[PDB]
């Protein structure tokens, strides 16, 4: 298990495509995800866009959930029309935590 061997997670800088992939024949199951900015050390951008570390967008979860739920892999633009606009002027990001489960029982 090269990774943490438990719960997968990806993060991407606003405006770029993000890609999720589940091992074997498992499928991605979005648990939690957000679009915005809650840290200033992620996606190194201009200081002015990195100043506000308080931006949340709950609905971002529904978007990724619908796009990656029950799928082995999914690609989405961490911005553009694919994500609303909660804090315009800040360099956001998209964080998604998910797990991979069998497409069937056991």
What residues line the site for ligand RAM (CB under 6 A)? 14, 49, 79, 85, 88-92
State the DSSP H helix or E strand holding residue 29, giving kind and residue range, or none if neither.
strand 26-36
Question: Should residue 72 be labelled a site residue for ligand NAG when binding is judged by CB under 6 A?
Answer: no
48/103 with CB nearer ligand RAM: 48
Q: Two tokens at 61?
A: 């979860």
Query: How far apart (Å, rounded) are the C-alpha atoms in residues 96 and 60?
Result: 9
93/98 with CB nearer ligand RAM: 93
Residue 80 C-beta: closest distance to ligand RAM, Å: 9
Which residue has 């497409």 as its token pair?
103
Dihedral angle of Cα 89, 90, 91, 92, to the nearest 10 degrees: -120
Question: Should residue 49 be labelled a site residue for ligand NAG when binding is judged by CB under 6 A?
Answer: no
Residue 91 C-beta: closest distance to ligand RAM, Å: 4
Q: Two tokens at 101?
A: 């489960």
Which residue has 């964080």 as its token pair?
95
12/74 with CB nearer ligand NAG: 74
Binding site for ligand NAG (CB under 6 A): 69-70
């Amino acid at each position: 298990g090269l990774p943490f061997g438990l719960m997968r997670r990806e993060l991407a800088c606003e405006g770029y495509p993000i890609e999720l992939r589940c091992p074997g024949s498992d499928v991605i199951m979005v648990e939690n995800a957000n679009y915005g900015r809650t840290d200033d050390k992620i996606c190194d951008a201009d200081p002015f866009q990195m100043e506000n570390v308080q931006c949340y967008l709950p609905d971002a979860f529904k978007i990724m959930s619908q796009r990656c739920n029950n799928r082995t892999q999914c690609v989405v633009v961490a911005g553009s029309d694919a994500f609303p606009d909660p804090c315009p002027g800040t360099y956001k990001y998209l964080e998604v935590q998910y797990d991979c489960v069998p497409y069937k029982v056991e």
